[PDB]
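Retro notes, item 3 of 5
We never archived the inputs for the 2-chloro-5-nitrobenzenesulfonamide complex last cycle. Fixing that now. Sequence and ligand:
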Amino acid sequence: HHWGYGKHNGPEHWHKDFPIAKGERQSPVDIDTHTAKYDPSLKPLSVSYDQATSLRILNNGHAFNVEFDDSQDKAVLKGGPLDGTYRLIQFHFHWGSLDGQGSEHTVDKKKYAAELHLVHWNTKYGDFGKAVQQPDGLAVLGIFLKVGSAKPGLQKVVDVLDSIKTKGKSADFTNFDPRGLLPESLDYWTYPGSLTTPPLLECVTWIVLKEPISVSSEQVLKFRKLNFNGEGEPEELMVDNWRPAQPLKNRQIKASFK
Ligand SMILES: NS(=O)(=O)c1cc([N+](=O)[O-])ccc1Cl
Ligand SMILES: [Cl-]
Ligand SMILES: [Hg+2]
Ligand SMILES: [Zn+2]
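Structure as it came back at the time:
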């Protein structure tokens, strides 16, 4: 009985094996744009993905990960609310069964069709493993996806999904440039949070971009062809793999823009 997104193992059940699910800084959260406050103390956000080196793509049972070689100082996120440098290790998405839902964070209660998460670990901690034992160990750059015009830079990911349909399958995925998945503006909202998936560790500084990227209906439709199940098992489409908004509690969301 592994955690998942179904009726008997979904978000409302996670707290049993992962008590921190009811913690003080859980993610995602609803971003109330009117309550968010512009923060002058925030420094310019820096996303440097020019040397990013992808290795492979994997269906892990709850989503698919595009993994990067993080053994060297490449693909780094710094500035903004961050102290020091954070290194990109992987990115993945959360999406719905319909265009009207799919994102984890919401904006004034609005749900987007999907949400992209670029995961980075604080280099001061040596590696990802040690980083997730720290309150400021991770930084996730979140980007909303809406259905409209296709995103050319996403097609290479879409076309390889047919090879990793079921849980456990992986495939080489080199030379993929994540810069092609970024919107024009880096305006963002930021707050202290957690992993949105078990173990739900509270080590994340969330940086959610205001401007969504547009992807085509065809592209998201292919995301929905993936399977939660492993090969040879009854088909359970990989859809609605998103956790709903959690209590903001003692937290303030800061905006990088006026
Ligand atoms: N959703 S997330 O970005 O908080 C996240 C997801 C996973 N995952 O479910 O593979 C690992 C790390 C992080 Cl920070
Ligand atoms: Cl597991
Ligand atoms: Hg999983
Ligand atoms: Zn995620």
